Design a protein around this ligand. Sequence first.
Ligand code: NI
Ligand code: NI
Lengths: 131, 132
Amino acid sequence: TMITHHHSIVRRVDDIVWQSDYEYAIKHGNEYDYVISVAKECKHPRASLWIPQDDNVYIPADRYVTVYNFIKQHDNGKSKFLIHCCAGMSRSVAYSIAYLVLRYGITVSEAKRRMGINYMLHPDIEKSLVM
Amino acid sequence: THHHHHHGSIVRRVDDIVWQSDYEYAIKHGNEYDYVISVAKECKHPRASLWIPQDDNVYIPADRYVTVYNFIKQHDNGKSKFLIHCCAGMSRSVAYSIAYLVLRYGITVSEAKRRMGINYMLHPDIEKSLVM
Ligand code: NI
Ligand code: NI
């Protein structure tokens, strides 16, 4: 018999950085000076920075540092940054946590608390966040 | 904004003794048939009398078309109904049904399509396979 069903994530990271899913980034990307796509399969058409990142795998520190460096070096006190993946639960949350850790010298727990992340990412992503 | 997952259950008459369908029809009406023939790898009827592990969108070797034609001819005792099904009922089971009609009745692919009301081209490699 016929079935009728339906199947947007955005979180503030700090004063200057937001984290989202692809849907939010497409609909609201123009509200940001810089869009950072950290999913291989969800590359914003006007992404300033794209890391072709697979999900559910260990993320090397050099990727975390590339994104942190990108934000810090373009932080002119007037710029807003959006980090997004596809569903906005795994890859963009990890890069966002890593940015907070690298920039403010806080723990992974404290980063999550600030962003309101109350879950565990893929074991291998959580491992990657202990740099 | 919501979306719909419509029901299948599509069935075409092939000849006096043979019907062609999607998996949904085969599941819900299988018991109305003496012999269910499954010609999809991934849609094997739990009471299939014959199963060909056929992938879609590929050349079908003559050997397979002949296996199905022979199976129906051999079990055609004047008292038996046959159902040939794949998954969506538009490609693999249509190709095997067309090949059965060509082999048994010496008509053309185009005439077999006409009888069955097939107003479309199958995958190019399937169309190649039907020109035996
Ligand atoms: Ni759906
Ligand atoms: Ni509707």
